[PDB]
């Protein structure tokens, strides 16, 4: 019914498609060993023309300048087209978002809204036009939710499918009003989705496509209850009925087994070693006592100041506030993003950083996962994380779609616990290994 497009608008085509910046090593993606585990896994394609993507999908693909698919896309677009549950891991900045957004949209174009939602184009209470989304994508932070919502808007162009997004901090009424205009695909962070549901504005009764982006994060001790409250404890179709996809660049074993409570006869994609980094990212680790970090940071900022964006991670919200003040008063064009900032300031910070107006962003891990920003060329771990997975995700903000990047990290007493893991990751990444780091790992 819906695979036939609608009139275009050059206004929106300019407002949506930037132009895309494919990296120099976009072809080295083919050098990566892919693993597929499970019953009757469909074959991996090599071109977007190897399967039935609607006229809409191929048109919008040729708008974003995607030449040929990435490994995870080649393997996962069919699996989701085959309506199978999926757990996929692929390196940071390797195209997972489109890997789950293209097939879902193609399938909703073919299958249409279904008998269920076609049975509600006759009536509806005024205002209490609760929306029944077909698909739900859940992400761990607000800005990542919006980034995915925007990618959705790009791919649902000239289609009858209209996506929305709901997330905390923002005005609740504006989101309600945007829902009432019609929600088919819903991106959300957990708390605001539960708030919408307990207000009777959203219902998961016809939700047949579930996505957990940054899945291992959505399944930690803090998010597992909320994921259950949305999936198990409410009106969402259970496994086997709904189709559950989980994408991450990391999956610890324990979390990979906990994720089974939401999956049914699933494929397991592994585009590389689960938890591996891109080769395009040069990793430098330097010893820095605490009392010296600031001075040391300054030197880095004075060097890589060409036309590149620099992202600086710290471990607390107070710390981000304190450094951002320090750098501001030392004359730098900077902002910060952390939890204690209002959502307006938070998104504005992200915008200024993305547009170059403030090329230095001090950040807590709100920005560790999921965000891709063009021309981010240096990533600085002012504070190291406590585990190697947070580290992989952090340094993944640079060196994305084949482009190269630098990642410098401050190390000292407080970081002893990570030594071994960091050391190991340096080896398989083919990176310089500080000798005192080896001697520190016994």
- Give binding residues as ranges: 66-73, 90-97
CB of 325 to its own copies, least distance (A): 5
* Inter-residue contact 242 to 84 (CB < 8 Å): no
Contact call for residue 173 and its own copies (CB under 8 A): yes
CA distance 333 to 328: 7
* Interface with its own copies (CB under 8 A), residue from 51, 63, 117, 170: 170
DSSP state of 41: P
Contact call for residue 342 and its own copies (CB under 8 A): yes
CB of 408 to its own copies, least distance (A): 23
Window of 42-50, 103-111, 353-361, 364-372 that interacts with Mg ion by CB under 5 A: 364-372
* Inter-residue contact 28 to 279 (CB < 8 Å): yes
CA distance 201 to 179: 8
CB of 89 to its own copies, least distance (A): 35
Contact call for residue 180 and its own copies (CB under 8 A): no
* Interface with its own copies (CB under 8 A), residue from 18, 344, 355, 417: 344
Task: Give the pair of three-digit tokens for residue 405.
Answer: 């990047």
**Sign of the C-alpha dihedral computed for residues 102, 103, 109 and 113 taken in this order:** negative
**Other Cβ atoms closer than 10 A to 407:** 23
Contact string (CB under 8 A) for its own copies, positions 185-224, x = contact: ----------------------------------------
CB of 291 to its own copies, least distance (A): 10
Task: Give the pair of three-digit tokens for residue 319.
Answer: 């710390």
- Size of the residue set binding its own copies (CB under 8 A): 19
Give 111-115 contacts, CB < 8 A, sequence gap 24+: 112/1, 112/2, 113/2, 113/184, 114/206
348 binds, among Mg ion, its own copies, none (CB under 5 to 8 A by kind): its own copies
- Which of 420, 425, 419, 415 minimizes the C-alpha distance to 395? 425
Q: Report the number of secondary-structure helices (H) and strands (E) in the chain.
A: 17, 14
CA distance 88 to 99: 10
Q: Which is nearer to Mg ion, 23 or 54 (CB)?
A: 23
- Which of 111, 154, 125, 131 minimizes the C-alpha distance to 243? 111
Contact call for residue 370 and Mg ion (CB under 5 A): yes
Contact string (CB under 8 A) for its own copies, positions 311-330, x = contact: ----------xx-xxx-xxx
Window of 92-100, 176-184, 277-285, 324-332 that interacts with Mg ion by CB under 5 A: 92-100
Contact call for residue 140 and Mg ion (CB under 5 A): no
CB of 171 to its own copies, least distance (A): 5
Q: Which is nearer to its own copies, 266 or 332 (CB)?
A: 332
**Sign of the C-alpha dihedral computed for residues 230, 236, 240 and 246 taken in this order:** negative
**Known binding-site residue numbers for ATP:** 66-73, 90-97
- Bridge partners, residue 411, by sequence: 287
Q: Which is nearer to its own copies, 134 or 188 (CB)?
A: 188
CA distance 201 to 371: 28
CB of 310 to its own copies, least distance (A): 18
Contact call for residue 11 and its own copies (CB under 8 A): no
Residues forming contacts to its own copies in the complex (CB under 8 A) are 169-171, 173-174, 321-322, 324-326, 328-330, 342-345, 347-348
Residues forming contacts to Mg ion in the complex (CB under 5 A) are 96, 370
């Amino acid at each position: 019914d819906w695979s036939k497009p609608l009139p275009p608008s050059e206004r929106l085509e300019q407002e949506l498609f930037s132009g895309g910046n494919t990296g120099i090593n976009f072809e080295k993606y083919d050098d990566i060993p892919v693993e597929a585990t499970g019953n009757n896994c469909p074959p991996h394609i090599e071109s977007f023309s190897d399967v039935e993507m609607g006229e809409i999908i191929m048109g919008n693909i040729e708008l974003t300048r995607y030449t040929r698919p990435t490994p995870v896309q080649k393997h996962a677009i069919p699996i989701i087209k085959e309506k199978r549950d999926l757990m996929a891991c692929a390196q940071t900045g390797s195209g997972k978002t489109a890997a789950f957004l293209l097939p879902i949209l193609s399938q909703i174009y073919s299958d249409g809204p279904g008998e269920a939602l076609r049975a509600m184009k006759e009536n509806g209470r005024y205002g209490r036009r609760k929306q029944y989304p077909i698909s739900l994508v859940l992400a761990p932070t607000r800005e990542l939710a919006v980034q995915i919502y925007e990618e959705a808007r790009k791919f649902s162009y000239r289609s009858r499918v209209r996506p929305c997004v709901v997330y905390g901090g923002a005005d609740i009424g504006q989101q309600i009003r945007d829902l009432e205009r019609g929600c088919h695909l819903l991106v959300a962070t957990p708390g605001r989705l539960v708030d919408m549901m307990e207000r009777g504005k959203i219902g998961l009764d016809f939700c047949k496509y579930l996505v957990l982006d940054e899945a291992d994060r959505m399944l930690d001790m803090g998010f597992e209850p909320q994921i259950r409250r949305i999936v198990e404890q409410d009106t969402m179709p259970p496994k086997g009925v709904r189709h559950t996809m989980m994408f991450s660049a990391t999956f610890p074993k324990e979390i990979q087994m906990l994720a089974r409570d939401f999956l049914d006869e699933y494929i397991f994609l592994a585009v590389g070693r689960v938890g591996s980094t891109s080769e395009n990212i040069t990793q430098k680790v330097v010893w820095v006592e605490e009392s010296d970090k600031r001075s040391f940071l300054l030197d880095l900022l004075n060097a890589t100041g060409k036309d590149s964006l620099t992202l600086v991670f710290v471990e607390t919200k107070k710390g981000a506030d304190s450094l951002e003040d320090f750098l501001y008063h030392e004359g730098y064009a900077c902002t910060s993003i952390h939890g204690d900032r209002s959502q307006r300031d938070r998104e504005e910070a992200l915008h200024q950083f993305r547009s170059g107006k403030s090329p230095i962003l001090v950040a807590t891990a709100v920005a560790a996962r999921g965000l891709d920003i063009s021309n981010v060329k240096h990533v600085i771990n002012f504070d190291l994380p406590s585990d190697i997975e947070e580290y992989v995700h952090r340094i993944g903000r640079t060196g994305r779609v084949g482009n190269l990047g630098l990642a410098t990290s401050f190390f000292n007493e407080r970081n002893i616990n990570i030594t071994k893991d960091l050391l190991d990751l340096l080896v398989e990444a083919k990176q310089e290994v500080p000798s005192w780091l080896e001697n520190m790992a016994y």
